[PDB]
Design a protein around this nucleic acid. Structure first.
Lengths: 136, 79, 293, 212
RNA sequence: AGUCUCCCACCAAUUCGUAUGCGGAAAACGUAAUGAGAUUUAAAAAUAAAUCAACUCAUUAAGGAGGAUGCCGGUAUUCUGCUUCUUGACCUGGUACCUCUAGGGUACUGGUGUUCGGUACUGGAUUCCGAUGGAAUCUAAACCAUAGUUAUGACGAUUGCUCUUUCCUGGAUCGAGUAACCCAAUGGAGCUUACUAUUCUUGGUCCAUGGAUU
């Protein structure tokens, strides 16, 4: 933090150079300093989802959507920092490892509807293909 | 201004007034307003609930879901 | 109406008494002001905040309107109010505005320092804020600390008695007045007249002529000594006749029956109004359905 | 172990039934008066006495649904002036009176049993009304009014209106005291002993009070 | 105008991979239906607190098919199925594998044990090398608005509009007003506040009050 190095750096320039202010098309204003805030509708669903305690064994009519969206809610409210729900809901104070990994992800979704045909994945790891209609 | 404890007489007089309006003209089902005013004026004084275990607790008051201050001889609005 | 908010009571402070010649001059100029067409007249008092007020609360105002100017009110039917203005130079000097605001009907303060200006615009119970226009104003008038005290119950006063006295004070008067109307956005302003003799008085057509030349328009200058000064009087009078502008000790209907329009009828020593019991519970509840007034 | 901190689930229900009973009572009275008055145009009964008999004998079912102003008079007003008369220590010799203190007490008093009259207002279709209040809401006064032949229940706003009321003093020439209440600075009152954020405000909307 | 939010570099995934009533890239953003509360409360001061309105809060995935309530195969309403899909919490213990240099990376399987990631470019001029590439030197810039830097001035001549003196979005006359709140400083989308007292103007509602209808 010694100005001697600053003088050594400016030795590659003049004695006392003057710099212009930025052109007005390259300026930006400072945003807020506190972390972002979540919508309330995404807070209530996650809170009620974690507070919940845990005939081909599938029986999943329209409940598949409920499971496949509860998984996303659990992941979001277990990962994001902006999620400030309450004091009790935590990753370990409520069963998050056990849930959606050995309860929902495989026992429920996988065992109801078999994966549909056309398992031709792609030739890409980014979704990219053609959308053309011959004569339509 | 009001003195240290000269205000006690005023408090008790105002309490007397909002108590007296209930046993007067109590044949109208709209004594609930006066009931509510009395209770708001009894909490606002932060005073311990008035001599409860005697009256005001589900007996000798609030005969139904309103406060008609039901009379002796079992008189009631009967709604 | 027509109202004048300043007529100097001849006295320095609570030290010296008043000679009779000054009182006769005051009577003569009061009669002249009545002749010009003024209905309600104030009477000012100038004391500095850094002086003791007498301990005995009865003597906080020696004007004594009820028994000094009885005959003039008898003939001309004039209405006279007392007023006080305090010099504010340095805060942290004691002598709060508790009891001095009790005896009087209007309380005002003129500041002559930076601290005085800061104190007399946000955290006081005054109703008129005045400067001294015959000297240099203490501060450049901030465009925000003056417009944010008008929204309270405070107003500004312009006295033209300095524009007819000397030659050097006219320049200061013009400059300070231009500054005040510029900074205050010209919203709440009233006009008085610090006349020391009948020669210096002017009527409504001869007070607007001067002020219209310093920037202010004509309609606003007419409203200046009109209902605005009436509202100043209303705020001044609703401080010892009511608790918080909610329960007045006033009177009934009929023109000229209010808390400001009625001066003789209210016993100010006891602040009561004993009236004839003419309205009872067994009479028809409308205007004309009952005929007896 | 006797507070029963959960007996307050009827106060909510009582407060909910109150505000639904009052509306129906007011509407009932207004409709009854409006219907009853229109019977006097087809007939010749113009007095407060014979209309009572006529209605109770030709339309008797709705007879028991009228105000009857006198029922509110005998002790609900004339026997509660003594309330204020004792709240301020008012007697014959009033030389011991203390102004600005009675002004303090009256600011925190109850105005259910009292007689009110309008003196000044911004609505010149309302001057002179005299009535007996029954319930003083936040945005209204509700009172009973004695008409020439039939009584009415009138609700009049507080914003932009000045009321007065008199107080008898003694038996010396039948004098009295007179007080007046404003209408724009009445919701900011302290109901009892409180002290409540008394701010400072302008007065430019209170011009009509001294307009003449 | 402001003590206020969001955007003005990218992400196939240590980056809000967030299908959540509907709109929106996002927002201290807008709006629909049902329902409930106000220091006695999820909560405000000690917005509301007679009714309607206002404040706040809770619930509600799209498409398409089937049956019925109502009116002439139809639409508004009501209950039951179906389709939409990129192996995705963090930390950590095991086995198998790897073109990686005793350690790293990948597959299958067990354990409850408030801001932090990677990749990337200065403007201009001159020079050098057997090249859609590489190398060296010098000099300061990137300065850009149909208001653009604290500028928006001094006056005249017609026509509108509101009121009004006499008349015959009707026409001609007599006479007054055209205000209040206020002002750019890099730009935009939002929100929050200030105003129009016979003193510029336009439209509604009232289980507010007074009169006439009836």
């Amino acid at each position: 933090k010694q100005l001697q190095l600053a003088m050594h750096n400016s030795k590659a320039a003049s004695s006392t150079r003057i710099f212009q202010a930025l052109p007005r098309k390259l300026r930006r204003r400072t945003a807020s300093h506190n972390v972002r805030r979540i919508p309330k509708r995404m807070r209530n669903r996650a809170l009620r989802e974690m507070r919940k305690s845990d005939k081909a064994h599938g029986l999943n009519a329209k409940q598949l959507y409920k499971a496949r969206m509860s998984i996303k809610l659990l992941r979001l409210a277990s990962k994001s920092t902006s999620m400030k729900l309450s004091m009790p809901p935590e990753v370990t104070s409520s069963n998050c490892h056990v849930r959606q990994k050995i309860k929902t992800l495989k026992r429920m979704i996988k065992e109801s509807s078999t994966a549909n045909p056309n398992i031709k994945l792609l030739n890409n790891r980014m979704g990219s293909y053609d959308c053309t209609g011959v004569n339509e | 201004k009001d003195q240290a404890e000269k205000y006690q007489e005023r408090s008790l007089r105002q309490k007397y007034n909002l108590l007296h309006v209930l046993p007067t003209l109590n044949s109208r089902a709209l004594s609930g307003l006066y009931y509510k005013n009395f209770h708001n004026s009894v909490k606002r004084y932060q005073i311990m609930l008035p001599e409860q275990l005697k009256s005001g607790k589900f007996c000798s008051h609030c005969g139904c879901v309103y406060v008609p201050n039901f009379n002796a001889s079992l008189q009631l609005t009967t709604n | 109406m027509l109202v004048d908010l300043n007529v100097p009571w001849p006295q320095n402070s609570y030290a010296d008494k008043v000679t009779s010649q000054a009182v006769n001059n005051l009577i003569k100029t009061l009669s002249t002001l009545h002749m010009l067409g003024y209905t309600h007249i104030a009477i000012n008092f100038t004391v500095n905040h850094s002086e003791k007020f007498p301990n005995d609360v009865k003597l906080l105002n020696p004007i004594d309107i009820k028994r000094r100017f009885g005959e003039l009110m008898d003939r001309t039917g004039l209405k006279l109010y007392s007023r006080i203005t305090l010099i504010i130079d340095d805060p942290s000097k004691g002598q709060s505005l508790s009891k001095i605001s009790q005896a009087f009907d209007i309380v005002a303060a003129l500041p002559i320092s930076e601290k005085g200006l800061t104190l007399s615009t946000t955290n006081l119970d005054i109703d008129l804020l005045t400067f001294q226009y015959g000297s240099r104003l203490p501060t450049f008038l901030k465009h925000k600390s003056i417009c944010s005290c008008v929204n309270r119950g405070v107003k500004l006063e312009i006295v033209y008695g300095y524009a007819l006295r000397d030659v050097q004070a006219r320049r200061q008067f013009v400059s300070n007045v231009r500054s005040v109307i510029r900074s205050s956005r010209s919203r709440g302003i009233v006009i008085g007249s610090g006349a020391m003799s009948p020669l210096e008085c002017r009527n409504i057509l001869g007070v607007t002529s001067l002020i219209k030349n310093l920037g202010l328009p004509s309609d606003r200058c007419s409203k200046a000594m009109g209902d605005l000064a009436s509202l100043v009087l209303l705020n001044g009078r609703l401080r010892n006749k009511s608790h918080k502008q909610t329960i007045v000790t006033g009177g009934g209907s009929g023109n000229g029956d209010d808390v400001v329009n009625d001066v003789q009828g209210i016993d100010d020593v006891q602040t009561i109004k004993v009236v004839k019991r003419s309205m009872d519970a067994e009479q028809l509840g409308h205007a004309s359905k009952r005929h007896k007034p | 172990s006797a507070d029963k901190q959960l007996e307050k689930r009827d106060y909510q229900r009582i407060n909910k039934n109150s505000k639904i009973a009052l509306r129906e009572y007011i509407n009932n009275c207004k409709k009854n008066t409006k219907k009853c008055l229109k019977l006097a145009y087809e007939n010749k009964i113009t007095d407060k006495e014979d209309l009572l008999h006529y209605i109770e004998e030709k339309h008797p079912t709705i007879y028991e649904s009228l105000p009857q102003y006198v029922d509110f008079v005998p002790m609900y007003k004339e026997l509660w002036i003594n309330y204020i008369k004792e709240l301020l220590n008012i007697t014959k010799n009033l030389k011991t009176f203390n102004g600005s203190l009675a002004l303090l007490k009256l600011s925190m008093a109850d105005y259910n049993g009292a007689l009110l009259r309008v003196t000044k207002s911004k609505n010149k279709t309302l001057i002179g009304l005299q009535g007996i209040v029954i319930w003083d809401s936040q945005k209204f006064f509700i009172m009973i009014v004695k008409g020439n032949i039939i009584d009415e229940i009138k609700c009049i706003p507080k914003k932009g209106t000045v009321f007065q009321f008199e107080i008898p003093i003694s038996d010396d020439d039948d004098s009295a005291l007179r007080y007046s209440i404003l209408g724009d600075r009445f919701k900011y009152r302290s109901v009892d002993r409180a002290g409540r954020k008394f701010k400072s405000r302008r007065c430019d909307d209170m011009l009509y009070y001294i307009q003449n």
